[PDB]
Ligand binder design. Structure first.
Ligand SMILES: O=C(O)CNC(=O)C(=O)O
Ligand SMILES: [Mg+2]
Ligand code: NI
Ligand SMILES: [Zn+2]
Length: 331
């Protein structure tokens, strides 16, 4: 069995290997990369996403979100308070202000210590889930807006044509902006490209151990667990590496820098934080190996998780028994 300790693997494709996306995902899986839940892909030196980032300041962040925490330093939830619209140039200046800028630090480990110690005492502002792309239209390799669609994958594998579309999202981050513990919708893959700026630290639980994380989360968030049998779908709960280690939960960590891709694999729980002002692009995707995970994915039906238009068809076709209840949750 490849990668039996479920370590995060890092790949360096050549320019020739970077031509065929599906084939390279399948190659990484042949080496056991999916066992970790997360992999890093460093593009060949010949590749670029676009020519420059000098002209992005006029992008609008219509609904910046202030991430307000409750709990204790290692075990907390966050809620998202809506703020007034601002441009990417206004947001960059905000991120660099004395109130929000990254503190002085020695290295990534020191900054990680400071994050876990102090995150709860601040409320950073995040631009999230902004439909759009920063890939140049002429970038032919690993262009996140030109991937094959999940609806076409399901049709190719299962024969059923369905409605829906699949497009990328942009994220603008600052120091302490936080992504809560989650898997993707319908336990899909995701791919994330860090376009510019400061790093993102990731934490991940191997897919084969995901139920261990869920059992801990029920113990640590007991009211939330009573409210909903899949409350991690709400994307609000944080648990620190120290707390995971105290409770014997298997996980790994890695820092992504600008110019690097990360792939998350089906049912790989992940969480993390941004180091300072940055811009990332991400999209979900599927492969043949996903279909079995999609058929088994939990679902939130309490009303909280509320998701995209395109999830309807995935639930309807892969999970017909659950469809009626899930749809009540959506309405
Ligand atoms: O850019 C981001 O904040 C977070 N991304 C993810 O959880 C992902 O790509 O799967
Ligand atoms: Mg602009
Ligand atoms: Ni994710
Ligand atoms: Zn729910």
């Amino acid at each position: 069995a490849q990668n039996p300790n479920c370590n995060i693997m890092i790949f360096h494709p050549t320019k020739e290997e970077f031509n065929d996306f599906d084939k390279y995902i399948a190659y990484m899986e042949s080496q056991g990369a999916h066992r970790a839940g997360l992999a890093k892909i460093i593009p060949p030196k010949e590749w670029k996403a676009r020519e420059t980032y000098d002209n992005i300041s006029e992008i609008l962040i219509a609904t910046p979100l202030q991430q307000v925490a409750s709990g204790r330093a290692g075990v907390f939830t966050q809620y998202h308070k809506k703020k007034k619209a601002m441009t990417v140039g206004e947001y960059r200046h905000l991120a660099n202000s004395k109130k929000y800028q990254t503190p002085p630090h020695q290295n990534f480990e020191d900054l990680e210590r400071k994050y876990w110690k102090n995150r709860i005492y601040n409320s950073p502002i995040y631009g999230a889930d902004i439909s759009g792309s920063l890939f140049d239209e002429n970038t032919k390799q690993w262009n996140l807006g030109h991937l094959g669609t999940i609806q076409d994958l399901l049709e190719k594998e299962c024969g059923v044509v369905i409605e829906g579309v699949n497009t990328p999202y942009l994220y603008f981050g600052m120091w302490k902006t936080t992504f809560a513990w989650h898997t993707e919708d319908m336990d899909l893959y995701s791919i994330n490209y860090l376009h510019l700026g400061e790093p993102k630290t990731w934490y991940v639980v191997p897919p084969e151990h995901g139920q261990r994380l869920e059992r801990l989360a029920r113990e640590l968030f007991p009211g939330s667990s009573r409210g909903c049998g899949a409350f991690l779908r709400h994307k609000v709960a944080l648990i620190s590496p120290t707390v995971l280690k105290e409770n014997g939960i298997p996980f790994n960590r890695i820092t992504q820098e600008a110019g690097e891709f990360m792939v998350t694999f089906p049912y790989g729980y992940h969480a993390g934080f941004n180091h300072g002002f940055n811009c990332a692009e991400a999209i979900n995707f599927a492969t043949p190996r996903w279909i079995d995970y999609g058929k088994m994915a939990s679902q939130c039906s309490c009303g909280e998780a509320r998701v995209t238009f395109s999830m309807d068809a995935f639930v309807r076709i892969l999970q017909p028994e659950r469809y009626d209840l899930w749809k009540r949750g959506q309405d």
